[PDB]
Design a protein around this ligand. Structure first.
Ligand SMILES: C[C@@H]1CC[C@H](C)[C@H](Nc2nc(-c3c[nH]c4c(F)cc(F)cc34)ncc2F)[C@H]1C(=O)O
Length: 275
């Protein structure tokens, strides 16, 4: 099965990337899936009978009415809300480069798990407030990637004020990214100002936990505010899909879009063919 999964992910990612530049991505994706075989089996037959939950695969599943994980993706991390709730309120904010953004601010206490390939975390937040991030990962760089995502997701003003360029990122089709993705793409390029402005704090000696400093080095004495490093680290639902491959749950939350599909290329172990 792991080898079916590997080839299915490659096929689905290639299809989503190609579809995104078409005038009608949903129609393009459906035609490509209909015409693709993996190991000589119709891709649609694999999608119906394969439990993989990767972002591109789940976009393809949604397009043909299959149930998918209720979790969402941000920065490539799968987020599962484990406690709490939030309501959205539009607010206008001013970045550190004097650009205004209209952001859907989430109001309420929430806890999430974040699962990525190289790091995992527990994130506890309230309105525009990161409370705790307990993160585990393969190295300090992988941990830093999760921290950046969590700091942007928190919607904190100090993150908004750490922006140092204009935000005009677009997708493959030259469509402007939404504000949360604008902020994320900015800080993925360079997080030094974000990390230097976030704040540090002293930590207590807790077995299995350590701090991480703005320079991404470990410390037993201090850490980025709210952040601790640990050595320790889903229901399927009906979703909707639209022309531009935005996948929403029944309550309208945007679980997936092409912006959350990895750019990683790979070489399939089962032949992918196209008729
Ligand atoms: C990816 C887009 C940007 C961020 C994520 C991916 C959005 N999707 C969802 N966000 C939430 C959510 C809960 N609490 C939040 C918070 F405190 C801050 C925040 F930014 C989002 C949330 N819950 C379910 C979702 F499906 C997508 C969008 O809305 O465009």
């Amino acid at each position: 099965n792991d080898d079916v999964d590997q080839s299915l992910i490659i096929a689905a990612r290639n299809i989503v990337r190609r579809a995104t530049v078409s005038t009608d991505p949903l129609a393009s994706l459906l035609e490509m899936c209909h015409s693709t075989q993996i190991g000589g089996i119709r891709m649609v037959d694999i999608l119906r009978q394969n439990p993989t939950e990767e972002q591109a695969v789940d976009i393809c599943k949604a397009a043909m009415g299959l149930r998918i994980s209720s979790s969402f993706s941000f920065g490539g991390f799968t987020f599962k809300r484990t406690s709490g709730s939030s309501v959205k309120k539009e607010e206008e904010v001013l970045t550190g480069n004097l650009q205004t953004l209209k952001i859907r601010v989430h109001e309420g206490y929430e806890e999430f798990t974040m699962v990525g390939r190289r790091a995992t975390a527990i994130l506890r937040k309230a309105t525009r407030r990161l409370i705790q991030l307990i993160v585990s990962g393969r190295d300090e760089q992988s941990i830093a990637e999760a921290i950046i995502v969590a700091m942007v997701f928190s919607q904190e003003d100090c993150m908004i004020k750490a922006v140092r360029g204009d935000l005009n990122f677009v997708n493959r089709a030259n469509q402007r990214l939404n504000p949360m993705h604008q902020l994320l793409r900015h800080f993925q390029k360079d997080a030094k100002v974000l990390f230097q402005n976030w704040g540090i704090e002293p930590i207590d000696n807790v077995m299995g936990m350590i701090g991480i400093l703005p320079d991404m080095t470990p410390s037993t004495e201090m850490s980025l505010r709210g952040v601790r490093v640990s050595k320790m680290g889903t229901e399927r639902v009906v979703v909707s899909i639209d022309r531009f491959l935005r996948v929403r749950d029944q309550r309208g939350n945007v679980l997936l879009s092409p912006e959350e599909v990895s750019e990683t290329q790979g070489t399939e172990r089962l032949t992918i063919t196209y008729s």
